[PDB]
Design a protein around this ligand. Structure first.
Ligand SMILES: *Cc1ccc(S(=O)(=O)N(C)C2CCCCC2)cc1
Ligand SMILES: *Cc1ccc(S(=O)(=O)N(C)C2CCCCC2)cc1
Ligand SMILES: [Ca+2]
Ligand SMILES: [Ca+2]
Ligand SMILES: [Cl-]
Ligand SMILES: [Cl-]
Lengths: 227, 7, 227, 7
């Protein structure tokens, strides 16, 4: 997207979101990142929404194909599952490449740095969901390490109701439950996060209260499923 | 188990 | 898809449908058509489902972008609408190319020939929805001509309850209403089609009755909207 | 106005 203006790529990403053209949206936002400037809060959300929708569709398809493959156990189901898996891995590698070149290293404020480290944990987590080889353990540790650095910053620099801090804790708790086989750690993290946010709600405006309580309900929904 | 949505 | 077996392409198209990967499904079915053999009834449905979903998503996005463009009347909205429009036209041209090389000319039974001519009318109709240039009238006439040939065959060779005959009449009625600015012709065609099917329902099994009445309800739904 | 669906 080298010939298109940064502002035009951002505008087109917003149009692509409206049109539910998430592959286009991700391509526009990749082009915007590659301009080399840091991203504002809104632009970070556009980048995250685009890739989360692209990889979300790939993960759903991979799960359908993996289920058919497991029930069947010709080569066609495995071949097609492998094709989808390779495409999914390619998108995760693309996102991780953008974070490494050079979003994370230029992110100095807590809000941006936590945001990008949470993304890094998420995309390693999606790689871990399909991993089966010699590097599976290292993929899981890469997710854990990114989430943990984000957690350490968020606990020092953000209030317990901050929506990024809450969403990071939610996704790290899912990592513990679904990837790391640590359901007790998942439950403890979700409970402590919820309780500390509850005790801080009194400080918030009506609008911030709505933002924080929405994510708290997601933590509670998982705790209801897990306990 | 649900992770964060985009919007 | 030249190196993949015909039967493997068909199997993968079915898997892609299950996974809601309609672009893949269309690519597999294009490969299957290009093997050069005629398509069975099931295979014709796979081809039609794949492309109808691909172009259906493109049309929905084009409509969103066209609405934003009309309300705005920088270059970005027009540029992006044009990009989506060109992709849509390319898919329609691909389908029309498959019908012309060589599905229609090898289709001798009424069921296959009507099916493909209805597809030809549909994809010209989708081209007409976005057309604005010197060929718009010719695009509309191409849709009309394909639908009309399909109609002539269907009235001679199929019973009035046949689901392909009913779906052809439904889509030709939509052509009349939405493309040709002939709402009275649309209403007359939908009403006559519905009434003639009603009078033939007594000949059908329970399963055929369910198939025919489903499409009759679609005709009635349009008549309710139009009258 | 509705046209035919695929399935
Ligand atoms: C990981 C994460 C958490 C929270 C946000 S957000 O900016 O507060 N936002 C988009 C919320 C996301 C969940 C649903 C409501 C809004 C962004 C990213
Ligand atoms: C154009 C057309 C009409 C009907 C058929 S079908 O084979 O009878 N079938 C898939 C129906 C399509 C509408 C919803 C119920 C089934 C195929 C193509
Ligand atoms: Ca510039
Ligand atoms: Ca062969
Ligand atoms: Cl910085
Ligand atoms: Cl033939």
């Amino acid at each position: 997207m080298g010939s298109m203006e940064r502002a035009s790529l951002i505008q087109k990403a917003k149009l692509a979101e409206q049109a539910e053209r998430y592959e286009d949206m991700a391509a526009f936002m990749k082009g915007a990142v590659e301009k080399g400037e840091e991203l504002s809060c809104e632009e970070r959300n556009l980048l995250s929404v685009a890739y989360k929708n692209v990889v979300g569709g790939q993960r759903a398809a991979w799960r359908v194909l993996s289920s058919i493959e497991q029930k069947s156990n010709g080569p066609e189901v495995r071949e097609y599952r492998e094709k989808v898996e390779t495409e999914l891995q390619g998108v995760c590698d693309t996102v991780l490449g953008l974070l490494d070149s050079h979003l994370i290293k230029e992110a100095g404020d807590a809000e941006s740095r936590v945001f990008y480290l949470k993304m890094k944990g998420d995309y390693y987590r999606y790689l871990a969901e399909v991993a089966t080889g010699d590097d599976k353990k290292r993929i899981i540790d890469s997710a854990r390490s990114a989430y943990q650095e984000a957690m350490d910053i968020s606990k020092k620099e953000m209030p317990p109701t901050n929506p990024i801090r809450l969403g990071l804790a939610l996704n790290f708790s899912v990592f513990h439950y679904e990837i790391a086989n640590s359901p007790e750690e998942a439950i403890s993290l979700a409970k402590t996060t919820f309780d500390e946010a509850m005790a801080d709600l009194h400080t918030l405006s009506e609008d911030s209260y709505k933002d924080s309580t929405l994510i708290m309900q997601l933590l509670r929904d998982n705790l209801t499923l897990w306990t | 188990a649900g992770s964060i949505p985009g919007r």
